[PDB]
Symmetry: D2
Subunit: 124 residues, 4 copies
């Protein structure tokens, strides 16, 4: 388990804030606050992680989702982050993400942005 | 919202089976069974959807995650699907996905597959 | 194969992909997009595996269009990465990335991803 | 940006990208990968926006390598899509898709996705 390691507050290269708890049976629960886009304050996130990773120095696979609706705004969109947690002095979660917006069928070719976020326990 | 429309069993183009409950608060919970890769039986999934979508006939944005560990197997990996639900007679969830495996730092450039899954109510 | 790839292809959106595959592994031709900030034909260039596996695998390829021609400039570029699969029902199965020139501030939102399947008839 | 893009670039893995930007929007050159099933230099071709915006935006570009040369054939191709940012920190920021030739049964796992940043300084 990297339950110890994952749980807590993380920061990406944009200044976004990711607060998460890793449960014992593979759950990720928390809130996400984005520094960019059509977003204000905290959004619910849920995800999953590998609770029994390989002990061979490999990272721990995880992922989570945010739907960009809360008590402030609704951006009619959702982001999934897919990546791995890497332990050590400078712990890191390296991710790629997909951000899909609800579109009409004629616009659906342009529904989905892709990008990458690196999270550290210390802000930039 | 699409709570009723989304809740149920979905099948993708590979024969994979998505069983999902959409909650009133925007939650998705259920099980995923992959017909492909290093997987057997059901895996837990959790995700979110837009519980108050646009009414201009847009899709409903959603996403979910599966970590590929259950009682039977552990593939040391996780998939996320990001996409949108389109309701109607031929209801569809159109998704793109990222599958990341735990890797060493030297192999991290090769950690993440990308693909697309289209889910339908009937196989 | 050279001649199997060479020719006119159509995707699920009604776009038109006209390509010649060189013996040197080159792809050259033109792309006409049915959607987005585009009109008329655009130059494309790419590469393909000119000596693929013989075990029934497809043939890897990729190409780029920058969305500038004599009519329009959308300050963006698409790359398609995929594989050609021969046979009665010949297909090129691709995923693509479309990056627009952005400011540094908006760079997180620079790139769309999608998937196009090309066939020999519409 | 033709003079600015033209040159020898290195990514964070130490791969070498030698490119020439043409007047007519062409990119031509060689790529040498520090990782995967690769040896020596491979032909690349691509395109860039030869008349970009004047508003501080980057220059959109992309290129393709097929991983066949005289030394090796990985039966795969990578495309990089990104933008050139001029000036102080001269940078090409890209995302990439690496597709292998696969059987139809394995086509779900045909494509890797990643990100590479290029600078003229070898790290």
């Amino acid at each position: 388990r990297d339950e110890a390691g994952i749980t807590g507050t993380w920061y990406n290269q944009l200044g976004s804030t990711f607060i998460v708890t890793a449960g014992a049976d593979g759950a990720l629960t928390g809130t996400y606050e984005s520094a960019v886009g059509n977003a204000e304050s905290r959004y619910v996130l849920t995800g999953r992680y590998d609770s029994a990773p390989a002990t061979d120095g490999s990272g721990t696979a995880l992922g989570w989702t945010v739907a960009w609706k809360n008590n402030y705004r609704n951006a009619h969109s959702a982001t999934t982050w897919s990546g791995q947690y890497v332990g050590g002095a400078e712990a890191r979660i390296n991710t790629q993400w997909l951000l899909t917006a609800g579109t009409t069928e004629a616009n659906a070719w342009a529904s989905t942005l892709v990008g990458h976020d690196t999270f550290t326990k210390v802000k930039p």
